[PDB]
Ligand binder design. Structure first.
Ligand SMILES: O=C(CCC(O)(O)[C@H](Cc1ccccc1)NC(=O)c1ccccc1)N[C@@H](Cc1c[nH]c2ccccc12)C(=O)O
Ligand SMILES: *[C@@H]1O[C@H](CO[C@@H]2O[C@@H](C)[C@@H](O)[C@@H](O)[C@@H]2O)[C@@H](O[C@@H]2O[C@H](CO)[C@@H](O)[C@H](O)[C@H]2NC(C)=O)[C@H](O)[C@H]1NC(C)=O
Ligand SMILES: CC(=O)N[C@@H]1[C@@H](O)[C@H](O)[C@@H](CO)O[C@H]1O
Ligand SMILES: *[C@@H]1O[C@H](CO)[C@@H](O)[C@H](O)[C@H]1NC(C)=O
Ligand SMILES: [Cl-]
Ligand SMILES: [Cl-]
Ligand SMILES: [Zn+2]
Length: 582
């Protein structure tokens, strides 16, 4: 028994490394060059890896885990027992694989065109409009158009997708796809734990929400903003109203208090490569790993100009040979994208840190950890002090302080309910309580309930707004981002302390702290070998997820906001919850 298990795992590892590397290669070619050939080859490689998954999974299911002594081996085998999609019968598997490809391509090539005029793509055109336009009608055009072309077009595929991924889950011992995803955290209390964290940041979010609403009231008019109702979803500077820092100019606490970081980056010669190089340098400044020469040669750090159609949504790639790691991002030169570059570089650092673990264990402590690493560093990079060291800025006062806290919050705090929202909707879709006839109505009910947002124009049958959010048609879980946004503050808190920082947490910049680096590396090296609370404890000193670090970070802003909102007699929340615009 124990001997057969040790041998199975060794064989699984050497062969998975080969089969996974080959699949990644085909996946990469499709993602960076969407064509019928690359698509067809990716579909073919899907069956190859499925063959391998079916072969080893079947054998894994014959062993008896729990009657096995070694803990590492027991964990590896338990995992291999999950055939994920490879559990579906050949016909269903093929169909499923094709549906996923069709949704991904439909989303990545969608465009919104002006009658016999120009056609805009999501990146960089539509996203630039949402970020810079201050005209209600122009934002509406881009917001509605994107949902009309991308979301409406994903609808025809989704019910089948749901049917098939649920079927795969059931064949793997789960009750539905949501239950399967949820299990990646190995935490029985997960749903209640997350609900408690959400409720924790509620006071902070309702205050930020009220304050932003008043500012939008000021700029867009009383006729378009209800001071007691939800905010029209196209006005927050981001296509999904998931992060709001692009409307900072409309909400600046102390207008008399910074420069244009974009203009600085552009005139100072910043380019996508320089942006990734700066992230690389930040990691090595912490004693962490530099990316290999190969990374610079094979990555796609900007949208190609040779005519190639690509998947622009940012992603980091492990080719499972512990040498080849790459990023695929249609990077634009600006602070927001620099944060995203740092984020992707954290995924790469994780790949490099656990590259020596069996491939079954080359994963984050939990999916949230993988998402967090990168953001922890970007918090330091975002401080006024660090940005001035980068010459991107020409502060120091309390007003400057509140302004920085506001900027950060517009992103970090606003994202909490959005990130919470996405899988609440999908878990309900997967478990069957939300049928296709109600997909969109339920999405908006959640949009209203959690974010306090409303659609600027009524939605009609055939609308499928979730379809216009990458992760939905891409079938990428989303709760990981909610977890990340919470715990990255816990890690920042711990790293700042390990770096000897004193005073307000938001004034911390861990740049060049070897101690901070070592804190992370030790936990990053564990991959998925130990239960996540253990990685959590190594980094922070305790085993739980906690919203305290985040609250602590934003404490000064929470106090300022309460005072500011009370002075204007703001009514927190959206009492008049049925309100919709013009
Ligand atoms: O989706 C992303 C970044 C893309 C990703 O790096 O998370 C990427 C998504 C993906 C997963 C699977 C297939 C294709 C794309 N995930 C990875 O690159 C990745 C790699 C290895 C392990 C885990 C994830 N961010 C989210 C959350 C987000 C919004 N704004 C942000 C600002 C800073 C940090 C995160 C966000 C979003 O844009 O809605
Ligand atoms: C449980 O097994 C792990 C893993 O052992 C390795 O993988 C097996 C499939 C087989 O190929 C073995 O020959 C390998 O040694 C043991 O942990 C490893 O320990 C060695 C030596 O300390 C170390 O180099 C590796 O990093 C360890 N790997 C991991 C994942 O921790 C572990 O010692 C065994 N536990 C017990 C109680 O015996
Ligand atoms: C650089 C290297 O060889 N890393 C290997 C890794 O690929 C393999 O999965 C592991 C087996 O547990 O043994 C490590 O030494
Ligand atoms: C894109 O893919 C097509 C089809 O496989 C191929 O002919 C072409 O060479 C690729 N383009 C690049 C830049 O590699
Ligand atoms: Cl939406
Ligand atoms: Cl997840
Ligand atoms: Zn990510």
């Amino acid at each position: 028994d124990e001997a057969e298990a040790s041998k199975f795992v060794e064989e699984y590892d050497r062969t998975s490394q080969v089969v996974w590397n080959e699949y990644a290669g085909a996946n990469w070619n499709y993602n960076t060059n969407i064509t019928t050939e690359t698509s067809k080859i990716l579909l073919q490689k899907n069956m190859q890896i499925a063959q391998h998954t079916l072969k080893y999974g079947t054998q894994a299911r014959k062993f008896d885990v729990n009657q096995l002594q070694n803990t590492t081996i027991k964990r590896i085998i338990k995992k291999v027992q999950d055939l994920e999609r490879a559990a579906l019968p050949a016909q269903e598997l093929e169909e499923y694989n094709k549906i996923l490809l069709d949704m991904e391509t439909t989303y990545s090539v969608a465009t919104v065109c002006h009658p016999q005029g120009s056609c805009l793509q999501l990146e960089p055109d539509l996203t630039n409009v949402m970020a810079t336009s201050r005209k209600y009608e122009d934002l509406l055009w881009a917001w509605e158009g994107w949902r009309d072309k991308a979301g409406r077009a994903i609808l025809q595929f989704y019910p089948k997708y749901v049917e098939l991924i649920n079927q795969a889950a059931r064949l793997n011992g789960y009750v539905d796809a949501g239950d399967s995803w949820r299990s990646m955290y190995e935490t029985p209390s997960l749903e209640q734990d997350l609900e408690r964290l959400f409720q924790e940041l509620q006071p902070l979010y309702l205050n930020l929400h009220a304050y932003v609403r008043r500012a939008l009231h000021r700029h867009y008019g009383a006729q378009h903003i209800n001071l007691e109702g939800p905010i029209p979803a196209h006005l927050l500077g981001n296509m999904w109203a998931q992060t709001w820092s692009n409307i900072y100019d409309l909400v600046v606490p102390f207008p008399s208090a910074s420069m244009d970081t974009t203009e600085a980056m552009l005139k100072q010669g910043w380019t996508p490569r320089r942006m990734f190089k700066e992230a690389d340098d930040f990691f090595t400044s912490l004693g962490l790993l530099p990316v290999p020469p190969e990374f610079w040669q094979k990555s796609m750090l900007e949208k190609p100009t040779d005519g190639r159609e690509v998947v622009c949504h940012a992603s980091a790639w492990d080719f499972y040979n512990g040498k080849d790691f790459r990023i695929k991002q249609c990077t634009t030169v600006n602070l927001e994208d620099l944060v995203v570059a740092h984020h992707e570089m954290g995924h790469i650092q994780y790949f490099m840190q656990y590259k020596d673990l069996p491939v079954a264990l080359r994963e984050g402590a939990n999916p949230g950890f993988h998402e967090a690493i990168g953001d922890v560093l970007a918090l330091s990079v975002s401080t006024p002090k660090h940005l001035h060291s980068l010459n991107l800025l020409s502060g120091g006062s309390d007003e400057h302080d509140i302004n920085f806290l506001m900027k950060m919050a517009l992103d970090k705090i606003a994202f909490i309910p959005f990130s919470y929202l996405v899988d609440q909707w999908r878990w309900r879709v997967f478990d069957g309580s939300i049928t296709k006839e109600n997909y969109n109505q339920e999405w908006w009910s959640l949009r209203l309930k959690y974010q306090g947002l409303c659609p600027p124009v009524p939605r009609t049958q055939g609308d499928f707004d979730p379809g216009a959010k990458f992760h939905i048609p891409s079938s990428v879980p989303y709760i990981r981002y909610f977890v990340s946004f919470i715990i990255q503050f816990q890690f920042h808190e711990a790293l700042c302390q390990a770096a000897g920082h004193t005073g307000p947490l938001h004034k911390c910049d861990i740049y060049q702290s070897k101690e901070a680096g070592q804190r992370l590396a030790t936990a990053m090296k564990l991959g998925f070998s130990r239960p996540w609370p253990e990685a959590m404890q190594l980094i922070t000193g305790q085993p739980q997820m906690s919203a305290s670090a985040m609250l602590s970070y934003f404490k000064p802003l929470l106090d300022w906001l309460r005072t500011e909102n009370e002075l204007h007699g703001e009514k927190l929340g959206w009492p008049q919850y049925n309100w919709t615009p013009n």
